[PDB]
Design a protein around this motif. Structure first.
Motif, short mmCIF file in Angstrom:
data_model
loop_
_atom_site.label_atom_id
_atom_site.label_comp_id
_atom_site.label_asym_id
_atom_site.label_seq_id
_atom_site.Cartn_x
_atom_site.Cartn_y
_atom_site.Cartn_z
N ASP A 6 0.81 -1.20 0.06
CA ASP A 6 0.06 0.05 -0.13
C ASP A 6 0.75 1.31 0.04
N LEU A 7 2.02 1.24 0.61
CA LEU A 7 2.71 2.58 0.95
C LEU A 7 3.48 2.75 -0.35
N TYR A 8 3.97 1.55 -1.18
CA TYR A 8 4.58 1.70 -2.35
C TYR A 8 3.58 2.23 -3.31
N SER A 9 2.31 1.81 -3.61
CA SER A 9 1.29 2.39 -4.29
C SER A 9 0.94 3.82 -4.08
N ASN A 10 1.34 4.15 -2.78
CA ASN A 10 1.14 5.70 -2.69
C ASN A 10 2.32 6.58 -3.08
N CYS A 22 14.40 8.73 -9.39
CA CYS A 22 15.16 7.52 -9.04
C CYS A 22 14.25 6.62 -7.91
N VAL A 23 13.71 7.30 -7.18
CA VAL A 23 12.81 6.80 -6.20
C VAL A 23 11.55 6.01 -6.70
N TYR A 24 11.09 6.60 -8.14
CA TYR A 24 10.06 6.16 -9.01
C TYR A 24 10.44 4.74 -9.32
N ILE A 29 10.57 -1.37 -8.93
CA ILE A 29 11.20 -2.55 -9.08
C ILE A 29 10.81 -3.32 -7.48
N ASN A 30 10.82 -2.52 -6.31
CA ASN A 30 10.19 -3.35 -5.22
C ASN A 30 8.90 -3.51 -5.31
N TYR A 32 7.13 -4.83 -8.06
CA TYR A 32 7.05 -6.07 -8.64
C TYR A 32 7.60 -7.27 -7.96
N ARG A 33 8.94 -6.89 -7.32
CA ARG A 33 9.47 -8.01 -6.26
C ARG A 33 8.44 -8.41 -5.24
N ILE A 34 7.76 -7.59 -4.65
CA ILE A 34 6.85 -7.85 -3.49
C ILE A 34 5.43 -8.74 -4.12
N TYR A 35 5.30 -8.22 -5.49
CA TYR A 35 4.26 -9.05 -5.97
C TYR A 35 4.80 -10.65 -6.28
N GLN A 36 5.91 -10.79 -6.56
CA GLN A 36 6.73 -12.15 -6.72
C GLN A 36 6.33 -12.65 -5.34
N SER A 37 6.94 -11.98 -4.19
CA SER A 37 6.74 -12.81 -2.92
C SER A 37 5.39 -13.16 -2.64
N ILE A 38 4.40 -12.24 -2.79
CA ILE A 38 3.08 -12.91 -2.28
C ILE A 38 2.51 -13.88 -3.15
N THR A 39 2.64 -13.81 -4.36
CA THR A 39 2.33 -14.88 -5.23
C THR A 39 3.00 -16.13 -5.02
N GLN A 40 4.22 -16.14 -4.81
CA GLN A 40 5.12 -17.28 -4.09
C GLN A 40 4.47 -17.90 -2.86
N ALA A 41 4.29 -17.04 -2.10
CA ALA A 41 3.89 -17.24 -0.66
C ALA A 41 2.41 -18.15 -0.83
N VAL A 42 1.56 -17.35 -1.59
CA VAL A 42 -0.01 -17.90 -1.74
C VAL A 42 0.03 -19.34 -2.26
N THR A 43 1.07 -19.31 -3.37
CA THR A 43 1.30 -20.76 -3.74
C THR A 43 1.44 -21.71 -2.85
N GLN A 44 2.14 -21.65 -1.76
CA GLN A 44 2.42 -22.83 -0.94
C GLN A 44 1.84 -22.74 0.37
N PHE A 45 1.23 -21.58 0.94
CA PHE A 45 0.51 -21.42 2.15
C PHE A 45 -0.98 -22.33 1.95
N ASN A 46 -1.91 -21.79 0.88
CA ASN A 46 -2.81 -22.77 0.64
C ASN A 46 -2.70 -24.14 0.06
N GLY A 47 -1.39 -24.19 -0.47
CA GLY A 47 -1.03 -25.40 -1.16
C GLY A 47 -0.97 -26.53 -0.13
N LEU A 48 -0.16 -26.16 1.04
CA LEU A 48 -0.15 -27.23 1.91
C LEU A 48 -1.27 -27.00 3.30
N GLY A 49 -2.05 -25.94 3.23
CA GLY A 49 -3.31 -25.98 3.89
C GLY A 49 -3.05 -26.03 5.43
#
Lengths: 112, 112
Positions: A6-10, A22-24, A29-30, A32-49
């Protein structure tokens, strides 16, 4: 991760007024990387249940998932540096390998 | 190498009139690579002198060395793919990585 996204979106919205964006670039980049992190997490969190934390615990809700999935399934990380102004490209030729992965690996060939 | 350079130049002259320039683009890349190779060969040969093979072997003549320097003035290759026709850019984006001298820096990534 929620409030950081949320803070990055602000900050990405607020940073356009000032120059030397440069901040932009780093915020993009940050994000996109945190999107990668959230997707990777949700892949295994509910995957193992339930067995993962002894409970069917879902940290994120459908709100954030749907919003971000609809939001940045429009982003190509390779076009980011090529779309920035000419002055930014000339002055900050350094901050190009961050978008790709190559910067961590120009060193590894040395190590091998 | 000296004959190969002349053949590549002849092919470039002959094939510029024809249709889609896969041959033209690849011939340009090969010509530049052979120029790099001949420069790097001559520098080491004439640096190490007789000590290399126990003989003051001078492989090439001054004609070629004088000619390529004038023919290869400047010649930034990072914009070769950008200057090609738009149809070639759409169709043959695939070979875009050849110009950059980092093409294999995505597999040593995975060796780690």
């Amino acid at each position: 991760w929620e409030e950081s996204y949320d803070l990055y979106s602000n900050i990405i919205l607020n940073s356009i007024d000032e120059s030397n964006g440069c901040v932009y670039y780093l915020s993009q980049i940050n994000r996109y990387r945190i999107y990668q992190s959230i997707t990777q997490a949700v892949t295994q969190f509910n995957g193992l249940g339930l067995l993962t934390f002894g409970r069917h615990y879902k940290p994120f809700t459908d709100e954030f998932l749907a919003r971000i999935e609809r939001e940045m399934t429009n982003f190509n990380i390779d076009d980011l540096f090529n779309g920035m102004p000419f002055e930014f490209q000339k002055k900050y030729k350094i901050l190009e390998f961050l978008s790709d992965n190559q910067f961590l690996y120009d060193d590894t060939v040395k190590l091998f």
